[PDB]
Write a protein that binds this DNA or RNA. Structure first.
Lengths: 162, 183, 300, 299, 183
DNA sequence: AATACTTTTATCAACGCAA
RNA sequence: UUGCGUUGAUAAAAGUAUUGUUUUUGUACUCUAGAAGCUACAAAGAUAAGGCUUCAUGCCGAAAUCAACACCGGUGUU
């Protein structure tokens, strides 16, 4: 009922979500009309947003919260392509269109160079997303490679020397 | 076919039908008239039977489809064998009658393979006329790469300001309802 | 200067074919006319603003017979230039109201806009309606690619040019392609002979190699477009190292020098010339081709 | 044994690779691509939605032709005179008899220009002044009055009255058009008996019918990827329901709503934990007993 | 169509195919060569594109059917757009390939309307050649008075001394069995 | 081919509470 | 690096309204019921060229994706 009332914002969406998602609900019309006027009454409180967690993990965690005074990141600490590199991370993490384009063309350059020559240990990029991406791919592929974050060709040559 | 004065009248009629300024036509590559020579050709001066073969074939190739030149030959066979046709109507009116007889045979025998579309015609300067004519083809007779073996070419003379609809069913219904307005 | 470059190719086919603006033309006699000609019309949108008066006096100090009212209602134009003598249109508006036309009484229509003969007709698309009287066009028609042909009986190259508006959704299945007969018309207009051999096709930012036959020189270009569509085979080129060609810089012996603006509009339809196409890797490994296939790609 | 280096820019990457034990260049290169302009997607989106508006206007006129031909009032639509004043017939048919062909003219002109419906800030002040005018007349009477008084009817145009100057505009709400069409159709129903009540419900459905912003385009058999009738055979209920985000650790589960029991007990627990008996005591106290607040919770 | 040197080779090939003495052909009414001028035309002297339009159209009208000139136009469209065809085979061999493709489409789609017969060709002196070629038509596309809209024209190159049988079924079986011997 | 309105979803920053 | 509460910037997608440009027609203005098609107002048609089937609160068309070719997500060369 919270899902149906949060997402839908007017009468027909609320009504047909209450009639169609609650299987064999058999709701009356009076309570539908009063939920319509209730959603109309609170727009600043009820159209707040969506919680960053899911109901599966939170139903995993609401009983556990009580018995110990423990915080969420430490609680989750306590509970715990085959050669080429993916386009998953670079198509998902988009800050700008410009950053997305430039980093994916650079990663195509990177993987062409690692196909042609061989193995590596030092990769230099003139941020942290691409860093831990390459670091986890190289640990998962068991390769010790340290990635660290005319004119541009010369400058890349200079920082490859540096 | 046969090249004579009736072919000259048919050429001038279909040029006045598809092109709206005459200098869109007589300056095409392969045809390539000049202004004084075009006035000589148009106003009865030059005999069409002693001209170049490639120029008259280029004019006929621009104005007519490949199936339509065959229908010109067949209507020329039927026309010069009757005194009613020869002494009553000019040749381009009988060619219109022959063409609509073939269209009605297409609509009667196999109605569910008649397709159509909007035809596009290049001028002398490279720019085309969008919507110059109406193409009507049989979909069974396709050669490949967008070519059809049996294909005709019409022009609508309606007085209403509503365009031909798109889609197979809607355009087929328009063609069946406006069978006196196209020519 | 042994550095290699690597560009990205632009080969998309359904882009902006033209403006969506519908223009009007008239047939008239303007300037140095020995015959009638077709003229794209224009319009001053409103004369009482700051821009409309400036555009009016610009047209007036260029040529007085460009205005359509100058040729179709002259005495009203005399009553238009009596205000411009003694002041301007805004002052007439704030004293006497709207500039009405000539009439017997004060009952003519008001004058807010004025049409004129703007320019001559260039690249267009004829979209004239059924029951119309003058031509109606769409302008700003962009180029897409080039097909390079070569015949042996003259020993020189010929060059085609396709636009974005030369393709079409077709009439039976809704595919995006160009027919073979319209392609024969485009081949006929650009001067390509029927018995030439198709070499390759060029998109924008596609690496071209020009070699000579008498003095063994080599130049490398980027293709841009298929400019100057009055005389044939002219191709616009761009450098391989930089972005511009500023100056009267020389390139090779037989081509010449760049013009004063900085644009490289050459004519590659000549003898004593030879063309290759370069297909680089993403690391810059130039591979040279001479024949692409058997026929140009026409169905998409 | 080799070291890779990249210089990342807006439209270029310069790249190199070295050996570092000798220091000779193994490769150098420059890769150049065009920039990621967001002005082109704005152009493409604007043109797509404008094309949809033009399409749906023409389809309203087509649906009106189909309704008028199915009920048998007019046979062909080629002899209709396009040189009659539609506002004069629209205000005349409120009390008199429209002659079966001027009725089609009046209804076609009314369905060509319906109104706004977001109302139910100078622009707001002008449309409220126009609503303050239309409380006693229909909009057809307003437009005919503006026509035969000032000569102009359309656009936004200013007129100098005897003592004041006011800019006029052609924007009315849809409710006024619906009221006027209902009045005209009831009077012509009193005159002409071929316009049944199902004709009036179908015409008013053509007139005031709009889509919902959470529906999108499409139909049951039209299968759009921009609307709720997805092309995979299913049918969504709200198209912003497949855009709601994922979980933070299990990236295949939908999120929860902030305004339920579960997230709210989780948030009170997270603010309370930085024992169990008075946790449950405070939780049942805030749950079941009313007149609540933060100062009251600290009390 | 297009008039060039390939049309000259096609004309000389089909003249050598149907007529057995060349002076049966070049003295026909409407064509009307002379002996020195025919040797000028045949041996490469005269360019075909600047001749009279009526003479070249009379030669093409004698050697080809009305549907076959349309197929010449369509094969000319397809031939000059491919380097395999343009640099491997001459134009008359590709026209033969196009013609047999159309015949196979006729035999596959509607086998029970294919009729045929023996063709008869008039010489320059008024006397005809009996059995000059084999006519193949579709019976559904009849205009009247013994004319067919879709009609083709072949010649058998068999090595056996047995003639084509008569009757619809027997001649259809002969055409289906000898599909490599006709040309 | 531009100017007025309505709505949804998501992401960056920075200002604090905690780790 | 991760969660909560504020407010700025942005991106993607959806629903509407009023003009603008342009064609015909009518009315006014002009010249002798005709003509010119300038200058206004009003209807109706079109609004990137076009195209589809299911017959309708119908639908698609201006972005990004990119070196080609041959053999089992990989594999070889100009």
């Amino acid at each position: 009922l919270a899902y149906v009332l949060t997402l839908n914002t007017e009468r027909e969406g609320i009504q047909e979500a209450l009639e169609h998602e609650f299987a064999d609900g058999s709701f009356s019309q009076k309570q539908v009309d009063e939920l319509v006027q209730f959603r109309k009454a609170n727009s600043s409180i009820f159209g707040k947003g969506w919680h960053n967690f899911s109901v599966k993990l939170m139903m995993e965690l609401i009983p556990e919260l009580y018995e110990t005074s423990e915080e969420q990141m430490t609680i989750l600490t306590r509970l715990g392509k085959t050669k080429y590199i993916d386009e998953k991370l670079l198509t998902e993490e988009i800050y700008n269109p410009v950053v997305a384009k430039s980093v994916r063309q650079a990663i195509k350059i990177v993987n062409a160079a690692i196909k042609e020559y061989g193995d590596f240990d030092n990769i230099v990029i003139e941020s942290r997303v691409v860093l831990n991406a390459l670091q986890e791919h190289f640990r998962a592929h068991k390769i010790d490679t340290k990635v660290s974050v005319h004119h541009h060709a010369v400058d890349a040559l200079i920082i490859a020397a540096s | 076919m046969k090249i004579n004065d009736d072919i000259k009248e048919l050429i001038l009629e279909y040029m006045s039908r598809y092109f709206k300024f005459e200098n869109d036509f007589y300056k095409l590559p392969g045809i390539k008239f000049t202004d004084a020579n075009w006035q000589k050709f148009k106003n009865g001066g030059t005999d069409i039977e002693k001209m170049g073969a490639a120029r008259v074939n280029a004019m006929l190739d621009c104005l007519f489809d490949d199936f339509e030149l065959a229908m010109i030959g067949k209507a020329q066979t039927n026309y010069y064998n009757d005194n009613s046709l020869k002494m009553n109507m000019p040749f381009y009116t009988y060619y219109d009658m022959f063409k609509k007889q073939q269209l009605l045979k297409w609509l009667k025998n196999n109605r569910d393979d008649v397709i159509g579309g909007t035809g596009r015609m290049y001028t002398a300067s490279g720019n085309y006329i969008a919507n110059a004519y109406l193409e009507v083809a049989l979909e069974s007779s396709s050669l490949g790469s967008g070519s059809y073996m049996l294909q005709m070419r019409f022009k609508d003379y309606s007085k209403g300001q509503e365009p031909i609809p798109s889609g197979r069913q809607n355009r087929l219904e328009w063609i069946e309802n406006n069978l006196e307005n196209i020519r | 200067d042994s550095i290699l470059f690597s560009y990205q190719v632009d080969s998309k086919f359904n882009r902006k074919i033209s403006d969506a603006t519908i223009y009007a033309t008239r047939q008239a006699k303007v300037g140095k006319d020995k015959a009638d000609e077709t003229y794209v019309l224009g319009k001053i949108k409103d004369i009482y603003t700051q821009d409309g008066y400036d555009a009016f006096m610009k047209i007036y100090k260029k040529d007085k017979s460009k205005f359509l009212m100058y040729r179709h209602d002259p005495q009203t134009f005399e009553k238009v230039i009596e205000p411009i003598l003694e002041n301007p249109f805004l002052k007439y508006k704030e004293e006497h109201g709207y500039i009405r036309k000539y009439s017997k009484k004060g009952n003519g229509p008001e004058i807010k806009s004025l049409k004129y003969y703007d320019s001559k007709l260039g690249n267009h698309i004829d979209i004239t309606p059924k029951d119309s009287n003058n031509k109606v066009v769409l302008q700003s028609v962009s180029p897409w690619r080039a097909d390079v042909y070569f015949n042996k009986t003259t020993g020189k190259y010929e060059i085609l040019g396709l636009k974005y508006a030369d393709l079409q959704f077709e009439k039976g299945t809704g595919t995006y392609k160009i027919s073979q007969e319209k392609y024969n018309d485009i081949k006929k207009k650009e001067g390509v002979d029927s018995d030439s051999e198709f070499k390759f096709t060029l998109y924008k930012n596609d690496l071209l190699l020009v070699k000579d036959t008498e003095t063994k020189e080599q130049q490398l270009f980027r293709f841009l477009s298929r400019t100057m569509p009055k005389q044939k085979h002219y191709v616009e080129l761009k450098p391989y190292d930089k972005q511009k060609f500023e100056g009267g810089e020389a390139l090779i012996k037989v081509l010449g020098n760049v013009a004063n603006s900085g644009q490289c509009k050459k004519g590659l339809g000549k003898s004593n010339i030879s063309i290759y196409k370069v297909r680089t890797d993403v690391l810059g490994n130039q591979h040279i081709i001479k024949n692409e296939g058997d026929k140009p790609k026409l169905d998409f | 044994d080799l070291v890779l280096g990249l210089d990342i820019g807006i439209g270029s990457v310069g790249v190199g690779i070295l050996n570092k034990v000798t220091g000779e260049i193994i490769h150098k290169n420059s890769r150049i691509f065009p920039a990621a302009q967001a002005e082109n997607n704005l152009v493409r989106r604007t043109n797509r939605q404008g094309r949809r508006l033009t399409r749906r206007k023409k389809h309203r006129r087509v649906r009106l032709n189909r309704l008028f031909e199915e009920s048998g009032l007019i046979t062909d639509f080629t002899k209709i005179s396009i040189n009659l004043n539609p506002y004069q017939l629209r205000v005349k048919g409120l009390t008199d008899e429209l002659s079966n062909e001027e009725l089609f003219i009046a209804l076609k002109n009314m369905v060509k220009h319906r109104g706004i419906s977001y109302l139910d800030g100078d622009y707001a002040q002008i449309v409220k002044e126009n609503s303050k005018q239309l409380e006693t007349k229909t909009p057809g009477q307003i437009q005919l009055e503006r026509y035969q008084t000032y000569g102009q009817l359309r656009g936004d145009f200013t007129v100098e009255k005897d003592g004041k100057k006011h800019r006029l505009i052609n924007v009315f709400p849809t409710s006024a058009y619906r009221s006027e069409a209902l009045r005209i159709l009831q009077t012509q129903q009193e005159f002409n008996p071929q316009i049944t009540d199902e004709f009036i419900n179908r015409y008013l459905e053509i007139l005031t019918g709009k889509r919902k912003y959470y529906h999108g385009p499409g139909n049951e058999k039209s299968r759009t990827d921009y609307g709720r009738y997805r092309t995979s055979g299913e049918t969504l209920d709200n198209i912003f329901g497949i855009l709601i985000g994922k979980c933070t650790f299990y990236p295949d589960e939908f999120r929860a709503a902030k305004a339920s029991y579960t997230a709210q007990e989780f948030n009170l627990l997270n603010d309370l934990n930085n024992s169990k008996e008075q946790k449950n005591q405070i939780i049942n106290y805030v749950k079941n007993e009313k007149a609540m607040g933060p100062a009251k919770l600290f009390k």
